Amino acid sequence: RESAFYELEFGPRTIMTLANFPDDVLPLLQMESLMTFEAMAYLRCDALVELGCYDGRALEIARLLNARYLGVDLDQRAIETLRTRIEREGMSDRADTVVDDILNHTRRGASVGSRALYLLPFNLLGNFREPKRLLDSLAERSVAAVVSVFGDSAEATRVRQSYYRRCGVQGLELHTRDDGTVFTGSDGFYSRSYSRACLHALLAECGLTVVRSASNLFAHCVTVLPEGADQGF
Amino acid sequence: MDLTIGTHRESAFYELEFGPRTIMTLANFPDDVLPLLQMESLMTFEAMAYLRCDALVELGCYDGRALEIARLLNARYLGVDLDQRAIETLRTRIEREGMSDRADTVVDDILNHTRRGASVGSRALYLLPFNLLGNFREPKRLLDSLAERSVAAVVSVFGDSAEATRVRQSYYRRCGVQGLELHTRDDGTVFTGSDGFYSRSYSRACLHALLAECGLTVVRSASNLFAHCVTVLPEGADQGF
Ligand SMILES: CSC[C@H]1O[C@@H](n2cnc3c(N)ncnc32)[C@H](O)[C@@H]1O
Ligand SMILES: CSC[C@H]1O[C@@H](n2cnc3c(N)ncnc32)[C@H](O)[C@@H]1O
Structure with missing residues (x-):
């Protein structure tokens, strides 16, 4: 299960x-931030x-x-950093945190505001072997999502290999696929x-319409609307 | 006549190899x-x-921190830095992202560029990112130079909160700054x-006062625990479309 690695202490x-x-x-982080803002x-x-907010990477x-803010993560320590920041920035009335599995939150959690955007940041979607479970859950409590993934350029794969090595990921193995690198x-x-084509295909299969698609050397970022989500003001 | 007079200007540290x-x-x-980086990115974009x-x-673009x-x-982009290696990284990224027609770099002192450099596009915004302004003992010459080739600037600085000062101490120690000293001041720790x-x-108040002294009007101001970011217009810059 996707949550296994992130339930580990570190x-x-x-x-x-x-x-x-x-x-x-x-x-990748900059493109995702700008797309979420817009x-x-x-x-x-x-x-x-x-x-997967960690210490509140999108709070700003x-x-x-x-806007209202809810950060969801399994990391108790990172959430305490975020709680302290929310207090010190005078945002207690507008910003909250939950220590939980994201799928527990998307399936069972109360609504945040009237029109909520869900951010899947920094290749969160890419950590799921069966991503349809997460994407299918979004429609219930949101009118929109921003999905940020690593691309399949040679440079993206090289950056990722360097990144995952520095993180000290044990038994690290690279598997080259048609639609991306695992x-x-x-x-x-x-x-x-994800290739641009594979990402678009997956999102369409889960009833999510692409409104905006940005790419750079390292990443793909898409803004999607659920089919049957209110498009009003 | 004098062994080290004129050797500790802002560019000195950034002319060192590393x-x-x-x-x-x-x-x-x-x-x-x-x-800090996220707030200035959003303000620059807007x-x-x-x-x-x-x-x-x-x-002070380094490897193109605002290229995205x-x-x-x-938009057109110009990155200015003294670091040849970071400018090389930026040139490669510009090529590989197919931006060669609208993105360029210069290896030069930023003051040489602002004083003597050609205009970029028709309406240029100047970004002073990640506390660049704070590296100057006497920043007025940099701010005074901005009006000539810009209709707007975004200026990003560390604030003077206890947390900001602690984050900066940790940051500068991790950069391996030698003989690191902390000088407490009311309007911004040195x-x-x-x-x-x-x-x-900079305190919000000190930053605002400095910008006004250099004929730069604050039109947007944002703050978090760690930083102040402002959007400024020069007095007399055109504000058309
Ligand atoms: C951006 S992906 C990595 C971040 O998301 C968090 N994360 C990953 N998977 C989950 C999950 N299933 N539930 C909650 N947080 C998660 C991790 O703890 C980390 O901060
Ligand atoms: C954001 S401040 C640090 C960055 O700005 C660059 N920088 C600082 N001062 C100057 C200067 N006077 N001319 C050019 N680049 C500079 C440094 O080389 C680094 O990439």
């Missing part, structure tokens, strides 16, 4: 500590729900839009990249 | 640096769209180092 910390990031990770404005989302986006590790680590 | 690399390597960043800037000039902003707006390293933070 699974999340090793993956999300900036100290383990090659410089070339930054353009999507929330255009689709009139009053709430941002960040799945909600802050600049005066990395596996011995402690249940799983991460795949 | 000066730029040590400061701009993402691995040396505490996690709490990321909200400013360019609203003010109809067709060009982004990133001063220009790319997502289909860190110094052995090889000419100088970095100050």
Whole structure:
């Protein structure tokens, strides 16, 4: 199961500590941040729900839009950092956190605001062997999602190999596929990249319409609407 | 006549072989640096769209930390840095992302560029990212130079909160700044180092006062626990489309 590696004491910390990031990770994070900001404005989302938020990697986006924020992560320590930041930034009335599995939240959690955008950041979707389970759950509590994945360029694969080595992923193996590159590790680590075509196809199969699609050397970022989601203001 | 007079100007530390690399390597960043970088990225993106800037000039761009902003707006981009290795990385990325027609780089002192450089596009926004302004003991000459080739600037600085000062101390130690000293001041804490390293933070009030003294009007101001980011217009810059 996808949650196995991130239930390990230092699974999340090793993956999300900036100290383990090659410089070339930054353009993926920057594209995703800008797309999330623009999507929330255009689709009139009053709430941002960040799945796998760690220490609140998208909190600043909600802050600049005066939107509600919910961060969901399994990492208790990273959530305490986020809780402290929310308090010190005077955002207690607008921002909250939950320590839970993201699938528990998407299937069972209460609504955040009236029009919530769900962010799947920094290749979160790529950590799922069966991603349809997560994508199918989004429609219930959201009018929109932003999905950020690693691409399948030679440079993307090289950056990822360097990244996952620095994180100290054990039994790290590279598996070249048609529609992306899969990395596996011995402690249940799983991460795949996506071709633009494979990502679009997967999203269509789960009833998610692509409104915006951005690509750089390292990443694909898409803004999607559920089929049957209200498109109003 | 004098052995070291004129040798500790802002450019001195960044003319050292590994000066730029040590400061701009993402691995040396505490996690709490990321909200500063995210806020300035969002403000730069929004400013360019609203003010109809067709060009982004990133001063101290390193490997092209704001290239993605220009790319997502289909804007022209110029990256200015003293670091040849980081500019080479940026040139490769520009080629591979098919931006050779609209993105360029210069290896030069940012002050040489702002004083003597040709215009970029028709309406350029100048980005002073990641506390660049704070590396100057006397920043007024840089701010005074901005009006000539720009209709707008985004200025990103560390704030003077207890947390900001602690994050900066951790950050500068991870960069391996030698003889690191912390100088507490009301309007922004100053860190110094052995090889000419100088970095100050700014209070909201001090940053606003400095910008006004240099004829730069704040039109948007954002703050978090760690940082202040402002969008400024020069007094007399055209504000058309
Ligand atoms: C951005 S993907 C990595 C981050 O997402 C978090 N994460 C990954 N999978 C889950 C999950 N199933 N439930 C909650 N948080 C998760 C990890 O703890 C880490 O902070
Ligand atoms: C964001 S401040 C650090 C970055 O700005 C660059 N930088 C600092 N001062 C100058 C300067 N005077 N001219 C050019 N690049 C500079 C450094 O080389 C580094 O990439």
